[PDB]
Design a protein around this motif. Sequence first.
Motif, PDB file in Angstrom:
ATOM      1  N   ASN A   1      48.619  37.706  40.559  1.00 33.80           N
ATOM      2  CA  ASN A   1      48.189  38.470  39.240  1.00 33.80           C
ATOM      3  C   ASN A   1      49.450  39.539  38.900  1.00 33.80           C
ATOM      4  O   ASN A   1      49.560  39.529  37.916  1.00 33.80           O
ATOM      5  CB  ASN A   1      46.735  39.005  39.762  1.00 33.80           C
ATOM      6  CG  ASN A   1      45.831  38.098  40.131  1.00 33.80           C
ATOM      7  OD1 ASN A   1      45.765  36.807  39.671  1.00 33.80           O
ATOM      8  ND2 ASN A   1      44.770  38.427  40.542  1.00 33.80           N
TER       9      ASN A   1
ATOM     10  N   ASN B   1      37.501  32.256  33.696  1.00 33.39           N
ATOM     11  CA  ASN B   1      36.632  31.469  34.780  1.00 33.39           C
ATOM     12  C   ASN B   1      35.068  32.051  34.642  1.00 33.39           C
ATOM     13  O   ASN B   1      34.252  31.151  34.936  1.00 33.39           O
ATOM     14  CB  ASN B   1      37.205  31.817  35.885  1.00 33.39           C
ATOM     15  CG  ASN B   1      36.696  30.631  37.059  1.00 33.39           C
ATOM     16  OD1 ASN B   1      36.870  29.570  36.864  1.00 33.39           O
ATOM     17  ND2 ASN B   1      36.129  31.181  38.021  1.00 33.39           N
TER      18      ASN B   1
ATOM     19  N   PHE C   1      44.921  31.557  36.700  1.00 38.30           N
ATOM     20  CA  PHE C   1      46.366  31.617  36.890  1.00 38.30           C
ATOM     21  C   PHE C   1      46.993  30.846  35.913  1.00 38.30           C
ATOM     22  O   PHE C   1      47.888  29.782  36.221  1.00 38.30           O
ATOM     23  CB  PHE C   1      46.742  31.077  38.421  1.00 38.30           C
ATOM     24  CG  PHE C   1      48.024  31.629  38.798  1.00 38.30           C
ATOM     25  CD1 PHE C   1      48.493  32.776  38.443  1.00 38.30           C
ATOM     26  CD2 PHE C   1      48.789  30.568  39.518  1.00 38.30           C
ATOM     27  CE1 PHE C   1      49.832  32.962  38.792  1.00 38.30           C
ATOM     28  CE2 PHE C   1      50.315  30.987  39.772  1.00 38.30           C
ATOM     29  CZ  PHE C   1      50.720  32.169  39.525  1.00 38.30           C
TER      30      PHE C   1
ATOM     31  N   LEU D   1      37.073  47.051  41.690  1.00 37.25           N
ATOM     32  CA  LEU D   1      36.800  47.120  42.715  1.00 37.25           C
ATOM     33  C   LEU D   1      35.486  48.200  43.326  1.00 37.25           C
ATOM     34  O   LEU D   1      34.674  47.708  44.140  1.00 37.25           O
ATOM     35  CB  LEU D   1      38.178  47.649  43.674  1.00 37.25           C
ATOM     36  CG  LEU D   1      38.982  46.695  44.156  1.00 37.25           C
ATOM     37  CD1 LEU D   1      38.918  45.148  43.416  1.00 37.25           C
ATOM     38  CD2 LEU D   1      40.225  47.398  44.530  1.00 37.25           C
TER      39      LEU D   1
ATOM     40  N   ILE E   1      37.295  34.033  42.351  1.00 36.34           N
ATOM     41  CA  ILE E   1      38.063  33.419  42.904  1.00 36.34           C
ATOM     42  C   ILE E   1      38.196  33.979  44.515  1.00 36.34           C
ATOM     43  O   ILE E   1      38.216  34.886  44.792  1.00 36.34           O
ATOM     44  CB  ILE E   1      39.604  33.281  42.421  1.00 36.34           C
ATOM     45  CG1 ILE E   1      39.428  32.777  41.053  1.00 36.34           C
ATOM     46  CG2 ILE E   1      40.574  32.589  43.281  1.00 36.34           C
ATOM     47  CD1 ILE E   1      40.139  33.565  40.143  1.00 36.34           C
TER      48      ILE E   1
ATOM     49  N   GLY F   1      42.948  43.664  44.765  1.00 37.39           N
ATOM     50  CA  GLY F   1      41.941  42.542  45.039  1.00 37.39           C
ATOM     51  C   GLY F   1      41.851  42.291  46.601  1.00 37.39           C
ATOM     52  O   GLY F   1      41.524  43.340  47.223  1.00 37.39           O
TER      53      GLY F   1
ATOM     54  N   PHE G   1      35.800  40.956  37.653  1.00 33.51           N
ATOM     55  CA  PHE G   1      36.411  39.417  37.928  1.00 33.51           C
ATOM     56  C   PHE G   1      37.206  39.843  39.082  1.00 33.51           C
ATOM     57  O   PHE G   1      37.951  40.744  39.000  1.00 33.51           O
ATOM     58  CB  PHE G   1      37.109  39.007  36.589  1.00 33.51           C
ATOM     59  CG  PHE G   1      37.814  37.754  37.029  1.00 33.51           C
ATOM     60  CD1 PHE G   1      37.062  36.500  37.494  1.00 33.51           C
ATOM     61  CD2 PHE G   1      39.008  37.346  36.833  1.00 33.51           C
ATOM     62  CE1 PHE G   1      37.692  35.496  37.840  1.00 33.51           C
ATOM     63  CE2 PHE G   1      39.521  36.331  36.875  1.00 33.51           C
ATOM     64  CZ  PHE G   1      38.872  35.256  37.601  1.00 33.51           C
ATOM     65  N   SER G   2      37.312  39.068  39.792  1.00 31.72           N
ATOM     66  CA  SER G   2      38.139  39.049  41.084  1.00 31.72           C
ATOM     67  C   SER G   2      39.487  39.146  40.758  1.00 31.72           C
ATOM     68  O   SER G   2      40.285  39.848  41.565  1.00 31.72           O
ATOM     69  CB  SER G   2      37.873  37.873  42.185  1.00 31.72           C
ATOM     70  OG  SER G   2      38.393  36.879  41.471  1.00 31.72           O
ATOM     71  N   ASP G   3      40.145  38.756  39.818  1.00 29.76           N
ATOM     72  CA  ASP G   3      41.380  38.405  39.446  1.00 29.76           C
ATOM     73  C   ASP G   3      41.801  38.750  37.872  1.00 29.76           C
ATOM     74  O   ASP G   3      42.219  37.865  37.218  1.00 29.76           O
ATOM     75  CB  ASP G   3      42.045  37.056  39.775  1.00 29.76           C
ATOM     76  CG  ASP G   3      41.753  36.805  41.082  1.00 29.76           C
ATOM     77  OD1 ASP G   3      42.893  36.779  41.840  1.00 29.76           O
ATOM     78  OD2 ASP G   3      40.629  36.593  41.754  1.00 29.76           O
ATOM     79  N   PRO G   4      41.647  40.095  37.582  1.00 29.78           N
ATOM     80  CA  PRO G   4      41.989  40.195  36.166  1.00 29.78           C
ATOM     81  C   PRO G   4      43.385  40.659  35.884  1.00 29.78           C
ATOM     82  O   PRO G   4      43.828  41.594  35.571  1.00 29.78           O
ATOM     83  CB  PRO G   4      41.140  41.849  36.036  1.00 29.78           C
ATOM     84  CG  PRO G   4      41.306  42.466  37.279  1.00 29.78           C
ATOM     85  CD  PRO G   4      41.295  41.292  38.347  1.00 29.78           C
ATOM     86  N   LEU G   5      43.952  39.563  35.733  1.00 29.10           N
ATOM     87  CA  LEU G   5      45.391  39.284  35.614  1.00 29.10           C
ATOM     88  C   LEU G   5      45.838  39.975  34.280  1.00 29.10           C
ATOM     89  O   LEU G   5      47.251  40.021  34.168  1.00 29.10           O
ATOM     90  CB  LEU G   5      45.848  37.880  35.889  1.00 29.10           C
ATOM     91  CG  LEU G   5      45.469  36.551  34.974  1.00 29.10           C
ATOM     92  CD1 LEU G   5      46.060  36.592  33.592  1.00 29.10           C
ATOM     93  CD2 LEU G   5      45.485  35.427  35.491  1.00 29.10           C
TER      94      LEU G   5
ATOM     95  N   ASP H   1      42.235  36.046  28.747  1.00 32.41           N
ATOM     96  CA  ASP H   1      43.373  35.108  29.262  1.00 32.41           C
ATOM     97  C   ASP H   1      43.206  33.653  28.612  1.00 32.41           C
ATOM     98  O   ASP H   1      43.811  32.565  29.138  1.00 32.41           O
ATOM     99  CB  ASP H   1      43.095  34.849  30.742  1.00 32.41           C
ATOM    100  CG  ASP H   1      41.723  34.233  31.407  1.00 32.41           C
ATOM    101  OD1 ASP H   1      40.782  34.675  30.524  1.00 32.41           O
ATOM    102  OD2 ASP H   1      41.858  33.789  32.540  1.00 32.41           O
TER     103      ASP H   1
ATOM    104  N   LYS I   1      46.887  35.262  46.096  1.00 34.96           N
ATOM    105  CA  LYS I   1      46.210  35.285  44.485  1.00 34.96           C
ATOM    106  C   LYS I   1      46.493  36.885  43.726  1.00 34.96           C
ATOM    107  O   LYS I   1      46.809  36.569  42.465  1.00 34.96           O
ATOM    108  CB  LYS I   1      45.029  34.755  44.414  1.00 34.96           C
ATOM    109  CG  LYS I   1      43.887  35.776  44.962  1.00 34.96           C
ATOM    110  CD  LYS I   1      42.541  35.328  44.779  1.00 34.96           C
ATOM    111  CE  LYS I   1      41.312  36.240  45.373  1.00 34.96           C
ATOM    112  NZ  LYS I   1      41.483  37.623  44.586  1.00 34.96           N
ATOM    113  N   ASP I   2      46.337  37.669  44.698  1.00 33.68           N
ATOM    114  CA  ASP I   2      46.692  38.987  43.997  1.00 33.68           C
ATOM    115  C   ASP I   2      48.016  39.308  43.434  1.00 33.68           C
ATOM    116  O   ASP I   2      48.424  39.923  42.628  1.00 33.68           O
ATOM    117  CB  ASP I   2      45.831  39.964  44.770  1.00 33.68           C
ATOM    118  CG  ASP I   2      44.675  39.394  45.375  1.00 33.68           C
ATOM    119  OD1 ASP I   2      43.588  39.591  44.583  1.00 33.68           O
ATOM    120  OD2 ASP I   2      44.463  39.017  46.751  1.00 33.68           O
TER     121      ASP I   2
END
Lengths: 256, 394
Positions: free
Chosen positions: B170, A104, B279, A69, B293, B161, A54-58, A130, B166-167
């Motif tokens: 995060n 998402n 987010f 990546l 995203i 990212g 996932f692009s944004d694995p917060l 999340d 956005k990164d």
Amino acid sequence: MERYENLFAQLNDRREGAFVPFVTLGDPGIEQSLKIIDTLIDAGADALELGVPFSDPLADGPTIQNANLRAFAAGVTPAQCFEMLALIREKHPTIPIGLLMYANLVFNNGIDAFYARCEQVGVDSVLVADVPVEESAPFRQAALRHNIAPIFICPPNADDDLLRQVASYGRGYTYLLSRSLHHLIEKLKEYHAAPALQGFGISSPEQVSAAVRAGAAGAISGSAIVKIIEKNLASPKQMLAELRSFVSAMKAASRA
Amino acid sequence: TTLLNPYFGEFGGMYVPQILMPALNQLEEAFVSAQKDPEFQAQFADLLKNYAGRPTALTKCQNITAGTRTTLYLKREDLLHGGAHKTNQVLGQALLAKRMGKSEIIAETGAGQHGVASALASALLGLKCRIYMGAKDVERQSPNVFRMRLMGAEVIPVHSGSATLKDACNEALRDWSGSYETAHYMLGTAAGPHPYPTIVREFQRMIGEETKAQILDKEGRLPDAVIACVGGGSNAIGMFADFINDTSVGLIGVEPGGHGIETGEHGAPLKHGRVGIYFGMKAPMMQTADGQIEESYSISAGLDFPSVGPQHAYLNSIGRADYVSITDDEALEAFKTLCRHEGIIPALESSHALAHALKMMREQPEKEQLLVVNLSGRGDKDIFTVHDILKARG
Ligand SMILES: Cc1ncc(COP(=O)(O)O)c(CN[C@@H](CO)C(=O)O)c1O
Ligand SMILES: c1ccc2[nH]ccc2c1
Ligand SMILES: [Cl-]
Ligand SMILES: [Cl-]
Ligand SMILES: [Cl-]
Ligand SMILES: [Cs+]
């Protein structure tokens, strides 16, 4: 239909805890990822936790950020991930397969449609990293409608109301992030929660043994597998070899 | 359970890792308590007036509208300490942090204006401030980075990212999840998990409250429409909020159209994205067909937040507010026009709002209409970008 329940019955029949490695699907590439997972299983993994890039694995640390990546650099998409999930299941019919997802990717093509695809490919559980239990209703409903166990994290700062909710809403296993006060582990047993797997700081066989002794049904190594992959990018064959030796070392430690 | 509704219609929520729920529940309780606390409101009012410089002026543009029946006022948040509206809500959040016993600030920034506001608030109030910024934005915003560091803040480049806002968002969440016992996450727009969309709105709503009182004083009537650009939504919701129940007042948000909506290189998720969960919120977003995203594109750095506050998505859905877009070229022409005819150099962000007001006026020059544009920031930070574009052409 019943993979986590069957595994935990057998493990208890054999005086044993579960060892569950985490790895990111498609890292560092799809065929090498497939080779990695087959090695994990042959080495003694009782179940799998699999991340979809996932692009944004917060909710993930840097080792997993780098793993995403590498997978994205390999062109890995959710669709291809589900092709891997089907192939993995068709090779290994009994191993429980859990996904760690971001909301998402679940929400993207419809929530119910996501869990329907999990059922098609043979996934047993989904943890949505999340989505707290407070927001979980639409997710765990779709999960159950498609016979997927919705997994919930029990965090170290958990109060009693959360333990009750995690015990009520969770299925398959309870993802525990703790330093084992096994107060958490006993109150989860008390509230008849799904068997607790300890997921915090599991990078050595000593911590696998320690988690079982605390009463957890087993342990999840959230980073260490990925680290062994990251270190051995130059040599795919020393990667498979160190994966096998680490996983069996870890699995042998769960035999209490 | 929460004290306040986390949702605006279908949008919003608290889509965070479970470990962060106590941090959000703690913040909401402190906010609800602070809002009922006269001593908190007096401290907040004092900082805004005596440190940030409120009330800001409401300036009538007469050169701009000559030949038309449009009357144009600018709400001068560009005259706020720091040069942008961001200062309002960081002062409130910084007082919330101290009301919760916190001594550190975490912030994220894209253009650097929220970082600068966070650093100046932390400096004033005795908070240690660390700021996450995508490594590409750090590259491109060295002045704002130097400003932050002069004010004592730690600037941390985020290489993960895409290395953009956005990164950094995060990483700020990641950091807060382990540090929330001592750190407060100073979110910079009216987006993210509840209670941030609500808190930012209430800490920006003096923009619209002052505008209402000023416009009643100058024209004796409410405006036909208030207009503001929409990055993540804070300056717009700050302007909108006190007019939402004034149903005769149009609310117009302007997302960046970048190179044009049909090019795909834009930053207009509310009208041209697709609802997603990211987010901490359910909101329209810039995302691939896969649900990865993407970044927002705009000539203006400040409109780069790849989603939009959930209260805006809600206001759009019920038809209470309207959202439009403005391309780079329209914003640039509005930038030049304001410099030349009113002697005000606007932020390229606020240039989008102005550009839309100019279109309203120019398209229908005999329509009698009383417009207020929220001038969210000053444009001195943008003259280098504007200079390079002008010399690339002529
Ligand atoms: C001058 C100006 N006007 C408008 C905006 C838009 O943000 P908003 O929609 O929350 O008001 C910004 C955002 N700037 C943010 C996002 O990049 C920052 O991190 O600095 C701004 O700097
Ligand atoms: C608040 C702010 C500015 C104002 N100008 C006239 C009244 C008033 C109130
Ligand atoms: Cl003043
Ligand atoms: Cl006029
Ligand atoms: Cl109107
Ligand atoms: Cs945006």
